[PDB]
């Protein structure tokens, strides 16, 4: 399924995602965005069951912006992660459960960067790394054997490039293009994608 690679640097998190939208037979949109801007210092990545993903993501997004606007300051990324976890857990046992996996990664001035994992049951997890979708099994081995606690930005893009090209070689369907972003003291910034010739 759709991919979400978030890796935590010494003072940054590099979060990555694909840009493919398909309905069970073919890619309708070639520039899909499954990543949502929680605030200036936090972003959300939600995948899994489609349709539920988008409205749930905007509901959480508007909840967190409601918070940052009613109080004048945005949540800490850990607080936002726990908020989303509580919301989805409360809606879990309800008669309309939300079977959507999720990722959450951001930065805080007081402590530093953070990254959080959510299944379609939404149990929390903080790691210097994260992956979602059916390719997660494929690139988890790269994620482990190709990671050090001191990933540098250029080596970070090289490592995500390695994971990306292993997806392109191994994963069954086609992932043409990828969104990857840097989160640091200056906030959120967007980086480029990859492509591969076959001629």
């Amino acid at each position: 399924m759709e991919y979400l690679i978030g890796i935590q640097g010494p003072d940054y998190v590099l979060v990555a995602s694909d840009r493919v939208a398909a309905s069970n037979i073919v890619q309708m949109k070639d520039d899909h965005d499954k990543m949502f801007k929680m605030s200036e210092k936090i972003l959300l990545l939600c995948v899994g069951e489609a349709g539920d993903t988008v409205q749930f993501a905007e509901y959480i997004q508007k909840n967190v912006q409601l918070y940052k606007m009613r109080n004048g300051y945005e949540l800490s990324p850990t607080a936002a992660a726990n908020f989303t976890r509580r919301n989805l857990a409360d809606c879990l046992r309800s008669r309309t459960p939300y079977h959507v996996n999720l990722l959450l990664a951001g930065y805080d001035e007081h402590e530093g960067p953070a990254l959080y994992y959510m299944d379609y049951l939404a149990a929390l997890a903080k790691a210097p790394f994260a992956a979602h979708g059916y390719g997660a099994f494929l690139t988890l081995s790269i994620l482990d054997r190709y990671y050090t606690p001191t990933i540098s930005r250029e080596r970070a893009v090289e490592l995500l490039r390695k994971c990306l090209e292993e997806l392109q070689k191994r994963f069954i369907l086609n992932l043409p293009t990828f969104s990857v972003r840097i989160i640091d003291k200056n906030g959120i910034h967007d980086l480029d994608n990859i492509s591969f010739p076959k001629q």
């Binding site: 309905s23 073919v26 309708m28 949109k29 489609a50 349709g51 409205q55 309309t96």
Partner: protein, 201 residues
């Protein structure tokens, strides 16, 4: 069903067959798929026919209320999101929907695809229904963002006939619409047989 709607520099077209079937026997061959919900906003057809008609008529009521309350025409994005939410609370107990929200507003000609499953996705090329893949192949072979109005019309008719010809659950008539800053227009309606004669040679 088979609906194709692709966006280009000049505007957006929409495709529609007219064959309605209940299993094997064709229920009707004179079905208007794309709904003239609003004079500047167009809605498409897929899934349950009555589900689509009811939901699009609800959306038409909603946009008329919006344009009469806010005294401004509703955004295409707003209409697509409204459709998505109003059908979402119905998700899970028997809804069958797939629909394109197509129209031109202040943010340029817009197109979004809504469905019972839950995707409200934008994008240039939209094809849903039985012959969605057949239309997708010909369009992606022929899609260029720079299709001029007459050539866009010609390639539109070409791709739509290819779609209605390659499918087995499609037939009857053809519905074609174009969207511009003054609203939508009914371009043409060419039958399967006459257009067969035209496109055989």
């Amino acid at each position: 069903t088979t609906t194709l709607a692709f966006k280009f520099r000049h505007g957006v077209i929409v495709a529609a067959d007219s064959r309605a079937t209940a299993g094997a026997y064709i229920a009707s061959q004179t079905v208007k798929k794309v709904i003239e919900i609003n004079p500047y906003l167009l809605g498409t057809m897929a899934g349950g026919a009555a589900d689509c008609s009811f939901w699009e008529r609800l959306l038409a009521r909603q946009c008329r209320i919006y344009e009469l309350r806010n005294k401004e025409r509703i955004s295409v994005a707003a209409a697509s999101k409204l459709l998505a939410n109003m059908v979402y609370q119905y998700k899970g107990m028997g809804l069958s929907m797939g629909t394109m929200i197509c129209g031109w507003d202040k943010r340029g000609p817009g197109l979004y695809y809504v469905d019972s499953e839950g995707n409200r996705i934008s994008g240039a090329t939209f094809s849903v229904g039985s012959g969605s893949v057949y239309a997708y192949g010909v369009m992606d072979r022929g899609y260029s963002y720079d299709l001029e109005v007459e050539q866009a019309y010609d390639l539109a008719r070409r791709a739509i006939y290819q779609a209605t010809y390659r499918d087995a659950y499609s037939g009857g008539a053809v519905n074609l619409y174009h969207v511009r800053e003054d609203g939508w227009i009914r371009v043409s309606s060419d039958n399967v047989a006459d257009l067969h004669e035209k496109y055989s040679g």
